[PDB]
Amino acid sequence: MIKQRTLKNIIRATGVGLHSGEKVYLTLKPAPVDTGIVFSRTDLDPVVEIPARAENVGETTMSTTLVKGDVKVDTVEHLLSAMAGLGIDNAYVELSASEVPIMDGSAGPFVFLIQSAGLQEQEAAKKFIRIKREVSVEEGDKRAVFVPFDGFKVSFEIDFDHPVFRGRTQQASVDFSSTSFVKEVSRARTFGFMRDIEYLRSQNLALGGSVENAIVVDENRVLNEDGLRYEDEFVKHKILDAIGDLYLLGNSLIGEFRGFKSGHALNNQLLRTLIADKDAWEVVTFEDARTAPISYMRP
Numbered sequence: 001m002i003k004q005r006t007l008k009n010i011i012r013a014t015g016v017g018l019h020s021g022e023k024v025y026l027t028l029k030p031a032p033v034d035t036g037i038v039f040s041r042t043d044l045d046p047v048v049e050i051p052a053r054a055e056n057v058g059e060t061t062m063s064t065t066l067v068k069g070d071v072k073v074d075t076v077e078h079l080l081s082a083m084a085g086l087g088i089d090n091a092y093v094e095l096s097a098s099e100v101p102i103m104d105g106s107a108g109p110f111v112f113l114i115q116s117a118g119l120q121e122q123e124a125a126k127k128f129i130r131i132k133r134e135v136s137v138e139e140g141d142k143r144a145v146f147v148p149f150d151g152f153k154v155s156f157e158i159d160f161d162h163p164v165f166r167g168r169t170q171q172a173s174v175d176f177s178s179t180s181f182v183k184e185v186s187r188a189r190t191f192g193f194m195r196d197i198e199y200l201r202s203q204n205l206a207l208g209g210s211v212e213n214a215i216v217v218d219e220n221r222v223l224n225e226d227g228l229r230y231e232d233e234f235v236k237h238k239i240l241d242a243i244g245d246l247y248l249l250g251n252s253l254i255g256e257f258r259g260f261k262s263g264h265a266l267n268n269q270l271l272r273t274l275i276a277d278k279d280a281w282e283v284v285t286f287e288d289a290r291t292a293p294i295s296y297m298r299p
């Protein structure tokens with residue numbers, strides 16, 4: 001059967017919050033079967049646990065943010081994408097600060113962290129959410145939708161009105177795999193625009209943002225001196241952001257996702273609509289690896 005996976009070992013990392021600007025200590029730990037991904041705030045007495053699930057999402061305004069009354073864990077999306085990307089079902093994440101470290105602004109460093117620690121198979125069946133019929137959410141000009149598909153396919157369409165794009169709209173479509181995710185989606189960086197610089201920092205946002213952890217874009221061009229890791233990097237990161245946000249569903253998706261000028265707010269808006277719509281999904285497990293559609297890196 002296709003089994004659940006967890007970390008073989010403990011790993012530690014250290015970095016800075018993009019929005020907060022604080023130093024943060026991050027620890028990753030193996031966890032028991034059916035635990036899912038739990039986020040732990042170790043700088044509080046007692047320790048506070050916010051599970052990584054769609055129903056705990058609070059603020060979605062410029063990042064995906066989990067809420068347990070007083071306490072928050074912020075900017076979870078990139079880390080949760082690496083974890084979905086390598087098929088990590090169960091892990092404890094400990095943070096010493098309110099926000100997850102931005103690192104290089106991509107899922108690459110977390111992928112490096114998970115591969116070095118290693119994957120551990122567990123003696124329990126891996127469960128998936130299968131999309132049985134279409135679900136959609138619209139917020140004026142923006143849109144997002146789950147459709148039935150035999151595997152995992154993420155598609156994105158972005159219609160910026162910035163000179164950097166030459167009047168055109170950006171599109172990329174990915175057929176998800178563990179191999180395709182790491183070379184194809186995982187190195188795609190976070191981006192800011194010069195023209196949000198007043199607005200951004202008035203509300204205490206991107207306090208830790210720099211050319212070292214994001215694409216900084218001036219009106220004329222991309223200021224980062226070696227340019228872009230991918231020609232289509234902006235849109236591959238919007239795909240990195242979704243994959244991460246959808247994994248708060250608690251389980252791998254057999255289905256297709258399509259985004260049209262969508263973001264964290266709508267992505268979370270879509271999950272909740274799907275959970276409510278019980279007729280549009282079911283949970284499934286696989287007796288045989290050959291019968292299962294979606295392919296993961298082997299430990």
Ligand SMILES: C[C@H](O)c1nccn1CCCc1ccc(Cl)cc1
Pocket residue numbers: 018062063075077078189190191192193200206209210214216237241
């Ligand atoms: C944080 C979120 O994951 C995300 N992905 C792409 C853009 N964003 C929003 C980041 C906002 C941001 C604003 C300014 C700067 Cl310098 C850097 C980042």
Ligand SMILES: [Cl-]
Pocket residue numbers: 070071072098
């Ligand atoms: Cl807090």
Ligand SMILES: [Zn+2]
Pocket residue numbers: 077078190237241
């Ligand atoms: Zn992002």
